[PDB]
Amino acid sequence: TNDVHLSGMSRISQAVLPAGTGTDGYVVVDATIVPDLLPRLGHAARIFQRYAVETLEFEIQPMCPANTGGGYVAGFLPDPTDNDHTFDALQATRGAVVAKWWESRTVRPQYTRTLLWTSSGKEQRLTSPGRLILLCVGNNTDVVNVSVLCRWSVRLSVPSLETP
Amino acid sequence: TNDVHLSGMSRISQAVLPAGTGTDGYVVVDATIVPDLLPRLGHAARIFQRYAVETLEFEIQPMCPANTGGGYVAGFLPDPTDNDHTFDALQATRGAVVAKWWESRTVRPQYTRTLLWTSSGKEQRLTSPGRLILLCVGNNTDVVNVSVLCRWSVRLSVPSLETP
Amino acid sequence: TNDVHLSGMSRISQAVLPAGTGTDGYVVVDATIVPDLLPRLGHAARIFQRYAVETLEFEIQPMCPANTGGGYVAGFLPDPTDNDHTFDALQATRGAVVAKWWESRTVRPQYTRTLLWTSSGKEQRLTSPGRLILLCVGNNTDVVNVSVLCRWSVRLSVPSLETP
Amino acid sequence: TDAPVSKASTVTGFGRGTNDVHLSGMSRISQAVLPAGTGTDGYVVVDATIVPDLLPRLGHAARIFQRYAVETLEFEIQPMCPANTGGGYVAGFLPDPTDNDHTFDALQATRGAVVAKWWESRTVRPQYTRTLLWTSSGKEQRLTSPGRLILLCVGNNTDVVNVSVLCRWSVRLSVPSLETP
Amino acid sequence: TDAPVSKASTVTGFGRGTNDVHLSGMSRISQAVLPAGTGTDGYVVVDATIVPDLLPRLGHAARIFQRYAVETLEFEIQPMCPANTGGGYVAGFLPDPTDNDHTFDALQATRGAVVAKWWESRTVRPQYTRTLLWTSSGKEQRLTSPGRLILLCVGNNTDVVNVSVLCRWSVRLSVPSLETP
Amino acid sequence: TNDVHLSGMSRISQAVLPAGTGTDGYVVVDATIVPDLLPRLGHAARIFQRYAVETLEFEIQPMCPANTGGGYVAGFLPDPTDNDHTFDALQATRGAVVAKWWESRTVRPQYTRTLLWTSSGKEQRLTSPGRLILLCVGNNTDVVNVSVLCRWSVRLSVPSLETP
């Protein structure tokens, strides 16, 4: 059948937060989940027209010394159009996490499994499952290298050969 | 088995043989069948390590006036390492065809079904099912534009992110 | 029967990363998994001709203070010939991990269970399941002593007595 | 039937040659002569990589096929010397064409290895892959050869030794083609 | 078992190779190109004595056998030229390898001879002996070849003519040996 | 039970007895049967701690002219500690053979099937099933070259990495 099931785990974001610039509410990461953001899924969506996100998980992997103060709040807004970047908006989303800067965590988001479009278009809601937003909570004492990883699983349909 | 089955038709070769240059035995098309040669299988092998050829057929679709002279012989050598490019080598193999330049033909070859490698290596026998050769039979009279297409079906395995 | 099942856990790599030299993308570990790299499996493959890797896991055990910044990305390329040493290439592999320098992790790779050859030869793909690559992510503040361990399980066949 | 601009080609049976041929035979893969005293322990009397070229009729048959599978493979060490000859031989078929280990222990480790005196003949019934091998040569010879037969001296030979190493082979050839060296 | 002066030889399967092999195939026995005007009446386009050497796989197979019998023999005249070409050809298989008569009447006298236009393909179903022939060459070639296939022009060709002469052959090989040229 | 069963034939001893030196009772071969004596079992015991002898047979294969004089007596003492090397000790044991120098014989001995230790220790009775002795009977006339081979089958246990 045209449907092929792919899974993988890749880094959606890499950010560096210097010491003291991580004020409360600062936006460390704001990544709109698109197939191009994921390498293997990037090629897979380059050879397909439609994709549906069966499973989606995120892993916040901040690489900082244990003596680092402050923390982060990480969430997955299931609306690509939504631009709210406050603590309450993230915490309202299912699976959002709050953790110290030296404590890696996992986000298990909730979203609607609809058949999306691999290629971009006018309406972003038909192409992306949502956005991942990672904000600072409090103040960080050291420099934090944050890697945001995404464990994904998709179903691909309508074969084609697209261009970026 | 997280094996992805992918299939489709794609042009492996495009050749423009000018009138008068198509002497007998001239190698119009010489293509070692690797996934990088195929457009969609190119990306599929870019995101996978291993592939197995389940279905392989070649379609010689030359576009020239019906009053043109000469012909072609097309054949699939199941050995990628073999470098013999003559009418005898093509006639020995199975699935080979010989037809006039205005005719469209199908080569149904004898190919290995083992698990080959998408990337290149020291031994070509572990990476390609074989090569396809299209030669002139006689001398052409008009300008011939021959496109060699391939209906292929593969099974892909061992996810990765390869480079050209 | 000739088939004997062996398992074990041994250190494939020992590396020392001084303070500040662990720049992002630096290659800490690049080990081609061969039976000689594993002591007990080294002797076992010295008394056999063929081996098949039934189970393969890796444990990254970096020994550094909790106040160490930066991290690592560890992966198992299931292609011994592949020489890509970038973050995306590792992350595309199944089971790849990203972690802080003071956080031990485990890699559960995916690979094709084919009957390999214990002794070396021209084509490396017939002798090795792949390579383990461990790269730096960000900058390390302290000195990191990294031990890369491999928990393996093999099936051995075709008895012989080989020499190194 | 009207006259067309061009008629369709009428070549029908093209690319339909025979695919499988079973070929059996027996041939001398080696012949060695040893003057007295030369056959010290460990001396390599015979070292022959079993390939279609080594067997003449199989070589000619493999020149017109792409792949071959060894259905049957057996060897005979037939030394034609009297019973007053001292010393002996060890013979074994290494299933790895690449391995070049030439010792008593390496041969004895293999299945079917024989240790005999120079006035005794033996049959080596070895362990060989049944998988399809390539008739033509390539970069890796593990895809083209089932292995190599090795024959060493165990002790010093008192007299001259004439040893002939024979092979009964049965093969199935497949994927017809026309190979050239 | 007492120790004798010498033991009997234990070579058993020697001289027991395969005797009969049926080999079939199809090959181009000739290829000719004719520029405009050269193909006058009676011009000998093709003159090929059908021997195992003419057929490559059959040549290699006959190098390891002594005798062969032609079970099936058919020829195809396949001229790859347009329908606007003038002239024609006569094709026939003379069952006598020695006869070198190259005329229209000599070819037409034989059974299965075909007369066609240059834009028409024909199949020659000839008359050939089923008796055992010798794979290797000798003084008299009537014992080694079933005959010769001959192809002449009937009229002047207006355009260039490319003609390929093919052969479907089936043979049974017997009396195994190892021939050398 | 992660017990590895390994078997094969290997030469335990190679002796060159020159003509005239083979007086009656001369100890041609004296070998305490330990896994280090066997070539392939050498590596097998190098990667294991304990072994149990399931099958043990010795093959005396002397290579000499049929007109040579004298003979040999071969026997397996089931006690490694025993130091009696005489015809009487060999004739007392079971499985012993006596034959002319041109004859090839098989000693099927009486050996313990308990779990012995691959390494050496204070007590030899916990490490070896016994010893094999090959003695001269009479005086030889020609130079004798005797190889003592052993068909052995063992069960190995308790993985380790031993030293010579």
Ligand SMILES: [Ca+2]
């Ligand atoms: Ca699209």
Ligand SMILES: [Ca+2]
């Ligand atoms: Ca690769």
Ligand SMILES: [Ca+2]
């Ligand atoms: Ca080997």
Ligand SMILES: [Ca+2]
């Ligand atoms: Ca070939």
Ligand SMILES: [Ca+2]
């Ligand atoms: Ca002859």
Ligand SMILES: [Ca+2]
């Ligand atoms: Ca020990």
